[PDB]
Amino acid sequence: KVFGRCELAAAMKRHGLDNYRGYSLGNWVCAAKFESNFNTQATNRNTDGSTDYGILQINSRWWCNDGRTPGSRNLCNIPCSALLSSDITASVNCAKKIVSDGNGMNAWVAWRNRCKGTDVQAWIRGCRL
Ligand code: NA
Numbered sequence: 001k002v003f004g005r006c007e008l009a010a011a012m013k014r015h016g017l018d019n020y021r022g023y024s025l026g027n028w029v030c031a032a033k034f035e036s037n038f039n040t041q042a043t044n045r046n047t048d049g050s051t052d053y054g055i056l057q058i059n060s061r062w063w064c065n066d067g068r069t070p071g072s073r074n075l076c077n078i079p080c081s082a083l084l085s086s087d088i089t090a091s092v093n094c095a096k097k098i099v100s101d102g103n104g105m106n107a108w109v110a111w112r113n114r115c116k117g118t119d120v121q122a123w124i125r126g127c128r129l
Pocket of ligand 1: 065
């Protein structure tokens, strides 16, 4: 599924991501924009052999099982394929664990480099939330 900006903002809010660990909804929508362009089916291979999956590009090195990331963990206890579903429940549930790990949303390199410190409220502008 390719989400609309406000469609994804509504979905993230419903699933309790708005101001989760003190990160406003616009930070999450900004992260999703630059990680996946709001595409639930987005996959990208990392240099270390791990893969990033779904709207928030959750890494198989720590968070989900893809069977091909030697020495990796599955801290979200899910198959990485569950992170590509049109239903973002699994991605949001796993994102809550990531953002709670100690470095907040710095875990998302694209959030740090492209969203952090910017006018993230622009990402929910005009949305009926
Ligand atoms: Na893994």
